[PDB]
Ligand binder design. Structure first.
Ligand SMILES: Cc1ccc(COC2CN(C(=O)[C@H]3C[C@]4(COC(=O)N4)C3)C2)cc1Cl
Length: 285
């Protein structure tokens, strides 16, 4: 008599049979999270986390969102969090987009006729842009927290020279809020290893694809950028503002703020939480 294989486990040895999951096109398991409101959801919203991080970091945002009677759902991108795959490795950047579309396609079927929003930060924001541009007309609304549209020139050129000759980021540039930098540095699911070269060329590659997709955007969106962001240049968010065709487009600059605006100084963070709340609320009522 043949036997079933020993259960599939996350890279932290938890059986997938125990967690919300989905199998992707390459047969890799993805860890999933769901925040479901009491009663009928007004809409669906997918949260796309950034490079090195994981969906767990979006707990508070997602609870506010679910607060407005939306169904929030997320998964960890491949090579992130509790999803399978070599840490911060992807065959091609398009995998992230495809994997989102799959999760949305699934969720839409289970919840027919509901509008769907995207929320992304950083690389997760670049993924949201590409996701939207691949399906013009399909998403109700897009919320972008300092999305990767243009990469910091100082840093990009440094990396390009280093790559041309083939270290971990100073995590202080994340946030003026030093408690949040510390929380980041002590989260076991994060990948704080230096940026591999193959993944770094991929991100500069995504910058290029994002610029090509900009003119094709028609989806409504809210765009939150810090003026002193040393990872995703603020110039990128002006470009998005200029090139997108969306009839419904809005930009908040946070003067002096760094990169992770939902994890910044409370004045900033509270504003970020409020604007997202106001915007999504107006477009679901
Ligand atoms: C050389 C170079 C420099 C800068 C970028 C772009 O900056 C990246 C930072 N990236 C994220 O996605 C992470 C930031 C983080 C961590 O945890 C959070 O909450 N925020 C998510 C995008 C690309 C390249 Cl090639």
């Amino acid at each position: 008599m043949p036997e079933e294989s020993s259960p599939r486990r996350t890279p932290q040895s938890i059986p997938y049979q125990d967690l919300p999951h989905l199998v992707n096109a390459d047969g890799q398991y993805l860890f999933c999270r769901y925040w479901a409101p009491t009663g009928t959801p007004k809409a669906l919203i997918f949260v796309s986390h950034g490079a090195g991080e994981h969906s767990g970091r979006y707990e508070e945002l997602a609870r506010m969102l679910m607060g407005l009677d939306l169904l929030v759902f997320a998964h960890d991108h491949v090579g992130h969090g509790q999803s399978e795959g070599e840490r911060m490795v992807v065959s091609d950047f398009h995998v992230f987009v495809r994997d989102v579309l799959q999760h949305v396609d699934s969720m839409q079927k289970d919840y027919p006729g509901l509008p769907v929003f995207l929320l992304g930060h950083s690389m997760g924001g670049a993924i949201a842009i590409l996701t939207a541009a691949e399906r013009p007309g399909h998403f109700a609304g897009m919320v972008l927290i300092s999305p990767l549209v243009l990469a910091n020139p100082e840093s990009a050129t440094t990396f390009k020279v280093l790559a041309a000759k083939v270290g971990p980021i100073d995590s202080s540039v994340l946030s003026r809020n030093k408690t949040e930098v510390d929380i980041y540095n002590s989260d076991p699911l994060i990948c704080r290893a230096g940026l591999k070269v193959c993944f770094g060329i991929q991100l500069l590659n995504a910058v290029s694809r994002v610029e090509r997709a900009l003119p094709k955007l028609t989806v409504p969106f809210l765009l939150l950028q810090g003026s002193a962001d040393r990872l995703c240049d603020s110039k990128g968010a002006y470009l998005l503002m200029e090139l997108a065709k969306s009839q419904d487009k809005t930009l908040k600059i946070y003067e002096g703020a760094y990169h992770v605006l939902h994890k910044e100084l409370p004045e900033v963070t509270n504003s970020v939480f409020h604007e997202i709340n106001m915007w999504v609320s107006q477009r679901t009522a």
